[PDB]
Amino acid sequence: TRTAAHTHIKGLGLDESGVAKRVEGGFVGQIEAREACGVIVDLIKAKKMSGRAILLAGGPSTGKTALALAISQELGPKVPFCPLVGSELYSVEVKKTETLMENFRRAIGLRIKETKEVYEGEVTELTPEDAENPLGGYGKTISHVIVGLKSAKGTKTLRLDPTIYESIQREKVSIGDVIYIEANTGAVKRVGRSDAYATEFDLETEEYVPLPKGEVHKKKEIVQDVTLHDLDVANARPQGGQDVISMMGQLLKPKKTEITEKLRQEVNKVVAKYIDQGVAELIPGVLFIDEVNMLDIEIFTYLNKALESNIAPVVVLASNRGMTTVRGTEDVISPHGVPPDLIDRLLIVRTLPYDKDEIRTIIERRATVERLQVESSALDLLATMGTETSLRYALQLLAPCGILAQTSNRKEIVVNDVNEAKLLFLDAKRSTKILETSANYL
Amino acid sequence: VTRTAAHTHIKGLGLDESGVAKRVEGGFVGQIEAREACGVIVDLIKAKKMSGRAILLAGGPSTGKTALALAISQELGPKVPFCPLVGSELYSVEVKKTETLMENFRRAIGLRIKETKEVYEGEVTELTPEDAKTISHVIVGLKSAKGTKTLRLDPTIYESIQREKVSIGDVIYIEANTGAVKRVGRSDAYATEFDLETEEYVPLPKGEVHKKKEIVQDVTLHDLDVANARPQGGQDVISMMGQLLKPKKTEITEKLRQEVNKVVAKYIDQGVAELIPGVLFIDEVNMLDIEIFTYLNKALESNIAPVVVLASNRGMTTVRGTEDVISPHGVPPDLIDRLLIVRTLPYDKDEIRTIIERRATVERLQVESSALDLLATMGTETSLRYALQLLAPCGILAQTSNRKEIVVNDVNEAKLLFLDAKRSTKILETSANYL
Amino acid sequence: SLSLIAAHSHITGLGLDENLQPRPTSEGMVGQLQARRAAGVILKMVQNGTIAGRAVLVAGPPSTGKTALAMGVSQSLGKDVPFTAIAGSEIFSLELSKTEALTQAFRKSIGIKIKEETELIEGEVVEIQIDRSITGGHKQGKLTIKTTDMETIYELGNKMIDGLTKEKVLAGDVISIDKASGKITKLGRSFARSRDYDAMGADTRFVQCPEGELQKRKTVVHTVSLHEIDVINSRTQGFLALFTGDTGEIRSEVRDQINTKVAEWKEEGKAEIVPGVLFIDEVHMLDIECFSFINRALEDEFAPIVMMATNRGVSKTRGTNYKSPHGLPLDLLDRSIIITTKSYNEQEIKTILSIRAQEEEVELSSDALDLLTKTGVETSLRYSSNLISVAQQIAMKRKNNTVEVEDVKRAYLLFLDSARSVKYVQENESQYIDDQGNVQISIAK
Amino acid sequence: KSLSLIAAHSHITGLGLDENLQPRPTSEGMVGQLQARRAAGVILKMVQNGTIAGRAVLVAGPPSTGKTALAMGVSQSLGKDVPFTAIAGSEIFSLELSKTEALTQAFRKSIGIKIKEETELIEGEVVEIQIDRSITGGHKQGKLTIKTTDMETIYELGNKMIDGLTKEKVLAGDVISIDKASGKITKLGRSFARSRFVQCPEGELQKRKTVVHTVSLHEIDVINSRTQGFLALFTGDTGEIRSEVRDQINTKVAEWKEEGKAEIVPGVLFIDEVHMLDIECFSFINRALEDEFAPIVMMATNRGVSKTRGTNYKSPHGLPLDLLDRSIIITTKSYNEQEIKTILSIRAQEEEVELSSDALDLLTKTGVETSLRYSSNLISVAQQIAMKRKNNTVEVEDVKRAYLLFLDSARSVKYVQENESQYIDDQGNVQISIAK
Amino acid sequence: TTFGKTTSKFTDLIYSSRNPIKYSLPRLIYEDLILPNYNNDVDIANKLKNVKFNIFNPSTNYELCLFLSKLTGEPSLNEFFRVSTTPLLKRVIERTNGPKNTDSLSFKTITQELLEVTRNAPSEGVMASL
Ligand SMILES: Nc1ncnc2c1ncn2[C@@H]1O[C@H](COP(=O)(O)OP(=O)(O)O)[C@@H](O)[C@H]1O
Ligand SMILES: Nc1ncnc2c1ncn2[C@@H]1O[C@H](COP(=O)(O)OP(=O)(O)O)[C@@H](O)[C@H]1O
Ligand SMILES: Nc1ncnc2c1ncn2[C@@H]1O[C@H](COP(=O)(O)OP(=O)(O)O)[C@@H](O)[C@H]1O
Ligand SMILES: Nc1ncnc2c1ncn2[C@@H]1O[C@H](COP(=O)(O)OP(=O)(O)O)[C@@H](O)[C@H]1O
């Protein structure tokens, strides 16, 4: 098992219709932020509001990304979640507006159900039946095609259209192969060769596959999940044809293009047409952009434009700044690096720094998840380090202590282990103190 | 007949067997220490044992750094690769500058392959294929003026023969190893079948049909890298019209470089190839950004890096890409630790006079003694390059007066007609509106 | 062999015992008895593989051994574990974004292991007999394959005959056939039939006839990085993008699909994940957005262990207007553990110079080595290291085997360090080009 | 041939010089600038000798002093079959080439290779053509009768001649040229036979003719590179050609000159407004001038001590001192009254304008007062005002009308400077309304 | 164009359109740079750079070919050497939809999975109309 700075958080930890408790879901403290995130989860599950922005702000190492992952865990794996960094919007292929729109459309999911009728199994016979009165100037005038199927606890012969014989000849279907017949479209295809013919020849490069189970004929309801961006990039590219341009573009580098609003409008039109029949279901998700201080003001104005759309999902922003200038402007001093036009459109959630006991419990649970055993005195020294230097510095000094314990053939973490880890690895403060007092051209 | 461009009186470093340098020998005058250190660098390069050796040579303008680098390239010989470069050429609009630096690094490591050229040529007398439809082999009979000779051929060369529309009586060209087929044209014995025809007629070859020749092929690692990394695909031998899509330079992945090194090592271990490391010379290194200066630190630690020579004339100059960094010669202190600095000294009056006499000798001009003294005084007063540039208008003005020897009057007219930078600046300062 | 003597090629692994205790001098590296212990802890961290996404920082003065420490970690890591070593200027690309270049450098340093068991039939084709039925739907074949030792006869299928009609084989053709997978290759032509066709052709090649048995059993273990799977599953013919670098901003949905695919392979059990180390030399010259993406990209499960080296003090971060310690912002320094390297003394410089002259096959006297040690105390170490190789050639030009004090003095006279160059520029500043472009060319005033 | 209405330098047919390189006061459309014309004649002899290479000269002076006139005089004095590249300083700033690559292409476009080859040709007038077909039409037989003013003959045609004459249909009385070795046949025209129009050819029907080819190094560089064909010489997408093919072309050209199959004809590269190049381009120019295949570079600039581009300091002529160290400088001077009136009379003769003496004196006075180009622009625009009143010669009233209608620099600045509330300033402030 | 015009039992109509602009090339450049002969090494260097030192050659680089065959799933190990040595237009013209084995590192994306459903799908289906 691999653990990387997370995966000790499972959900938020609220009860039903009530206050989140202190010890639940891997969270310690941050009670008001957890209640606000639970209300946000309920608003997402209501499936009614569109284009809502929530900016959650605080100091470094407070639990912003932990709360975003708790949002994604509480919503479930069926609800889409697109984690975005603010540096990802700048590309050298398309404009940043198109990248923002693509990541915007990636957060809306569609649930499509369909009933499929199939005819699969091993081919028993293949006889193109001739007509009673053949036409002159031709040979082997097919009246119908007789195809016999064989599956596990099932055998059925079928009458086919004469036009299926061209598909039989095209895909090279012989006796003993296993096939897969769609009902309405016809369009047979070769799954492979049956396992009973695996020892037919000495040397043969042929896919051998097991005989399929169940009856030859079955009705299955298949629920498929796609996002709107997949529909956009599939409708945008030209379908499978015989022109040189399509296969030449398939054989080349797939450079992104600025998808027009007309294609998105028609996609929304046909999607709404298939919701109102009761077939499809629309699932909005969360587009999470953290460290939004790196965004340019043009992206902020396009966010202002794009948040008014009908199909827009909920977007969650995170920032750790105070009174800083917005990038791209030299005088707009603004809170959290966000221009005041966007700030009026969003609700602000505040996260608070921790204490002695919260840092101690966080270190204890992180050592529990990392499969390590620590003593009481080592835990108290680690908590003193966490409230002295940084919480993340105390969290990153656990596994090297486990290595130093395993070097001395001990499964216990004690005081001299964390003292050796202090003497080996430095934090930022002692590094800066070394830098400030050294004049060796460093 | 003969051309001269600022050089070609430089034939070598001009050293004896002990490594010491004479005063006037090999076209070089003065600067004994720099020439001796350059000879030491030449011997280190000829040792073929070290990689990533960086050398900086520094001095004032018109002191002879480029002449010293050209002397290195002449002393090493034509077998050793030499890639001269200016620092402005690393900036391109197709790929990043680091990839261009890596290409210029790998351009300086060469290989030598020994190959044999085998050629059949002559007039076709018999072309009789047979089937094993699939043809098993074709038998071709060739005729020249020294006899005839028949050959069995594989069907691929028969297909290439059918590509050139070869019939009976056509003079063709077959290479035995590669398999290329070239149709020269119809022979002169069939030139009177028609009075007018669209077919050119060539005579028979006067030599044998069979020709054997040993040749040496010199390639570098960059040629193999660009041969193995064509993105569009393999090109045909003859394509006079261009490709349908324009090939552009790409960022070559280091895995391809690893595979090329593996293949070259495998071919070296069988005694076919010989490894010849060479010299990458960068002039005006102060025109480089700090990103290329950082990437040079990584690129000098490779096991196949060549010997790098840098030349600069700046003093305590700000490095490009920085605002508050003052460094000697425009070279950052992280990189100036890794090289060895060779200093280059300015010249005196007698050295300038000898340089002017040598340049008049190589340009095939005759000058007087007093004209030489005046040109030496002019060179000491304005610049050394000014007299060298003014030597040839003096010869033209002497030619227009029907004389074969430059005198003081022609030097006076050349001084009057063409100005230097100092007099042009003094005109620029005392002028009303833009000179 | 295509390797010459590089700058630090004496370093073969970290000089540690079983208890992670560094020796004073062993297997290449001299001194630095705490950075070696910390790098050994980092090596055991990588070799355990149970944690992911942690960045360490190697900080110290220049010419101390940070990249020597990285080379030692790379050499003691061994094979089959990926080690990507990039510089700071490589990510600024004209055809690729900075963040996507960082993502590709992250995913080139973590791979999976695939085990393949093969059954190879390599031999020379003698005769092929093709038999057809009455219907003609399927074709049967006879293969007569011959080794130097023995010869036997196999059977063909319809797909085998169809795949042998592609890439035409004749008598005297060296092929190899896998029993399980049906892989087909044409090794070339035997040397026994190199004198019949009288002219080779373009597509032909001559290989020796194999010996030994026909059906040889051998297993192969493949190590495939995640970036290779990303490049392959993004195009119709993607290996040319692997060897030419024109991948061009691979979409994130195929990366999530490949992550789920690798998780499915690990749970089912046909592959296992081999983590690795990504080394970024000179991390101080990276843009602040790259630092932000490094901060947020280390929390994924498929993230390697990052090593960064910086020789800068409190300097200005690129892309911003302020000054920070080590040239990096405080958010990245919070997500780090710093390894500090310290400068050497006379004995360590003496041992390092002795090792470097030992590898370069240069024999020094005791007094010449003492002079080189004094110069390495006064000037930098690399000046002495280059003076060794220059003075060896000076000794060969004098027809001497071992170098002497005179060769080191001649190399010190003929070649200059930084301080003497700075002084000689400063006392003759009129002959060099100033910041304002002012210079004097004429020597007589 | 070389269609042109009227150029601004159309009167300069070359450098007016004697056999002793002495400038006449008025010859070949050039007047004044005696020392500059003598220096340009010396540079012309340097180009024509061809024994030295890679020398850069600089033409610096005040604006409107005839620097471009000197460059056009040198270009016309060189004549044909010698390369002459004239580029501006803003042309090299490409989006798909680098600056060094564009400078390299401009350097190699200015040196050429002279190759002499001979090709045997047939050209005459077609008398009569027979095409014969068999019963099945498998074999085609033919006879062609072709004549000149001195002979007549009949040729027995093969199959490919028959297909080459059926394609691009040739009838009787047609004058054609036939290349046997390539199969290309071109129709010259029609003969003068009433019973385009070209006369009948004379002499022998089968002539061995020698054609002298001149090809630049950039063309062989483009063809030798396998990435793009010869169509990139016209489309213009060469795209950063590698240095290896340049080295192969260098070695091949050197061995061709050594064998004697080809000669090297160097030329002149003229850079106009050289002060607007970056310092990287200047640094490339310093190290590109010592190659064996380097042309003679002419630069023209008119600036004083100004800021060099890409830097933060000021330099003489807008160029760094190391570039000026390898240059010999020709300085041009301002004109007098007599030279201005002679220039205006020559421009009158080239613009088919008849001028009175008083109109010429008024033009000379207003040219000395303001600008030479202002008078040279007013002289052509006064003729239309003269033709509006239906008289041929341009009088004083037409010149005064043109002076009233069309302004110059100084009067426009004077009119702006007390009306600046009506014009947009540096801060974007303007007043539109008449009142308040 | 400059074609063959008429200056006025079947009539022949042959395509003869040319361009008025003529580019003249001497024979020496062609015969000494593009055509092989005894005194040049065009074919030798072409073979040396395309066959002997190619990294997709199975006679010298079998490990890379086996690695790429595991990666892609090509049934033939000479596929990469054939792909790397023919032009792009020739590659796209004769591309065949050959089968690939399942035991490989590459399978189908979601977009292509949606794509192969609607090759011959009729109307009124939801996935075809979407
Ligand atoms: N309330 C909490 N409960 C448990 N762990 C926490 C809590 N807050 C922070 N952490 C831990 O701190 C580490 C860093 O927090 P992070 O999400 O980076 O905060 P921020 O986003 O504010 O920088 C995470 O690995 C997380 O597990
Ligand atoms: N020692 C020397 N002997 C002969 N010629 C020299 C010497 N030093 C320099 N030169 C000549 O001076 C000219 C300019 O020198 P150059 O190499 O440009 O110096 P830098 O590269 O420092 O500007 C060259 O053409 C060279 O031939
Ligand atoms: N611990 C060490 N043992 C042996 N050699 C060392 C050691 N540290 C540094 N060196 C030598 O110093 C030279 C350059 O040092 P380097 O590792 O580049 O320092 P830095 O990484 O700080 O720039 C290398 O060639 C290496 O041989
Ligand atoms: N000596 C001269 N002889 C003939 N015409 C001249 C002479 N000097 C200048 N001119 C004319 O002056 C006009 C403008 O001069 P121009 O050469 O454009 O100025 P500049 O040298 O600043 O480019 C040109 O049409 C040119 O013909």
Author numbering:
A (entry chain X): 22 to 463
B (entry chain T): 21 to 152, 161 to 463
C (entry chain Y): 16 to 460
D (entry chain U): 15 to 209, 220 to 460
E (entry chain Q): 1029 to 1036, 1069 to 1190
The paper states:
Unlike other chromatin remodelers, INO80 preferentially mobilizes hexasomes, which can form during transcription. Here, we report cryogenic-electron microscopy (cryo-EM) structures of endogenously purified S. cerevisiae INO80 bound to a hexasome and a nucleosome. We group subunits of the INO80 complex into four modules: Rvb module (Rvb1/Rvb2), Arp8 module (Arp8/Arp4/Actin/Ies4 and Taf14), Ino80 module (Ino80/Ies2) and Arp5 module (Arp5/Ies6). The Ino80 protein consists of three major regions: the N-terminal domain (NTD), the HSA region (Ino80HSA) and the ATPase domain (Ino80ATPase).
In class 1 of the INO80-hexasome structure, Arp8 engages with the ~35 bp of DNA unwrapped from removal of the H2A-H2B dimer and an additional ~5 bp of flanking DNA. In class 1, the hexasome is almost identical with the unbound hexasome, without detectable additional DNA unwrapping. While the INO80 architecture appears similar to that in the INO80-nucleosome structures, a major difference is that it is rotated ~180° on a hexasome compared to a nucleosome. When INO80 binds to a hexasome, the Arp5/Ies6 regions used in the context of a nucleosome are repurposed for different interactions. We observe that Ino80ATPase engages the hexasome predominantly near SHL −2. The placement of Ino80ATPase near SHL-2 is consistent with how the ATPase subunits of other remodelers bind the nucleosome. A site-specific gap at SHL-2 substantially inhibits INO80’s sliding of hexasomes (~2000 fold) while a gap near SHL-6 does not have a major effect. We further propose that the new contacts made by the Arp5/Ies6 module with the exposed H3-H4 surface provide an anchor allowing the Ino80 motor to efficiently pump DNA through the hexasome.
